[PDB]
Amino acid sequence: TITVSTPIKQIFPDDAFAETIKANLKKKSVTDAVTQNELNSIDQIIANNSDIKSVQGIQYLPNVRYLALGGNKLHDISALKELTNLTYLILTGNQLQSLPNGVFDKLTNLKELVLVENQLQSLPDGVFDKLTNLTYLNLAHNQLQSLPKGVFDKLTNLTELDLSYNQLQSLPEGVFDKLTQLKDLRLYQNQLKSVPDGVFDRLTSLQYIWLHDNPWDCTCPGIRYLSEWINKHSGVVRNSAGSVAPDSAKCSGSGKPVRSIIC
């Protein structure tokens, strides 16, 4: 906490973010000195496309519930770790290359986490484990080559998961086993050659899946599970136009539909 009144711009050294705070507080200048009681009044921050390089100071905003920081130049989110009241965190289009272990462990009220269009290469084991109220996780347009074993296991409330436009080489065995509420799963535009046997079997609520634009390896017998699953659930598979398209999972090399192959 801030113990003595202090200029907005000292607490929030990034010029653009200090201006966000000033406007939210209805203060007249970023040189105005502010109190912790004033900072306690902030219930959300909506600062998309604002050239923000740093959110240093945000740690003094304990009551922030909705945080939208899309389209800035953020490379560190250390300062968010204490924002225990956060329910929506939108970090689209920043320059995060990693998530330090633990960064989200106190964010237990989070319902939606949007990490689209960052440069995340990998995730630490258990990074999402405390996000037990999470319903929407969006990791699309990152650089992920793998997922940790068990990374979604604690996210039993998850209803949408978007992994599209990464470079996933494989999925861990069992990775979706706890996701019994998941309705919408996007895996399109990755580098998947295969999925684990049974990988969709616990997805009792699944209504929509995207599998297109992966270089599926249709060699037998490896492809049997996927081919069988698509045929059994053909109405669930969608293309990029959003239409029902079970043939949109294609064999790399032959180009024919995965679901046409009988081992």
What residues make contact with Mg ion under the rule CB under 5 A? 135
CB of 26 to Mg ion, least distance (A): 32
CB of 136 to Mg ion, least distance (A): 6
In the bound state with Mg ion, the residue whose beta carbon lies nearer, of 113 and 223, is 113
In the bound state with Mg ion, the residue whose beta carbon lies nearer, of 94 and 135, is 135
CB of 188 to Mg ion, least distance (A): 21
Structural tokens at position 35:
């109190």
CB of 182 to Mg ion, least distance (A): 11
Give the integer Cα–Cα distance in Å for 249 and 261: 11
In the bound state with Mg ion, the residue whose beta carbon lies nearer, of 87 and 97, is 87
In the bound state with Mg ion, the residue whose beta carbon lies nearer, of 155 and 226, is 155
Taking phi over 0 as left and psi of -120 to 50 as alpha, with beta for the rest, 93 belongs to left
Structural tokens at position 53:
């390089």
In the bound state with Mg ion, the residue whose beta carbon lies nearer, of 105 and 112, is 112
The CB-nearest residue to Mg ion is: 135
CB of 47 to Mg ion, least distance (A): 23
In the bound state with Mg ion, the residue whose beta carbon lies nearer, of 92 and 189, is 92
Give the integer Cα–Cα distance in Å for 235 and 188: 16
Give the integer Cα–Cα distance in Å for 230 and 24: 50
How far, rounded to the nearest angstrom, does the alpha carbon of residue 136 sit from its chain's CA centroid?
A: 8
In the bound state with Mg ion, the residue whose beta carbon lies nearer, of 184 and 247, is 184
Residue 248 dihedral angles phi and psi, to the nearest 5°: -80, -15
Q: Which residues contact 192 (CB under 8 A, 6 or more apart)?
A: 168, 169, 170, 171, 214, 215, 216
157, 133 Cβ separation under 8 angstroms: yes
Instruction: Give bridge partners of residue 146 from the DSSP assignment.
Output: none
CB of 133 to Mg ion, least distance (A): 11
CB of 176 to Mg ion, least distance (A): 18
Give the integer Cα–Cα distance in Å for 60 and 248: 49
Taking phi over 0 as left and psi of -120 to 50 as alpha, with beta for the rest, 22 belongs to alpha
Q: Which residues contact 70 (CB under 8 A, 6 or more apart)?
A: 48, 49, 90, 91, 92, 93, 94, 114
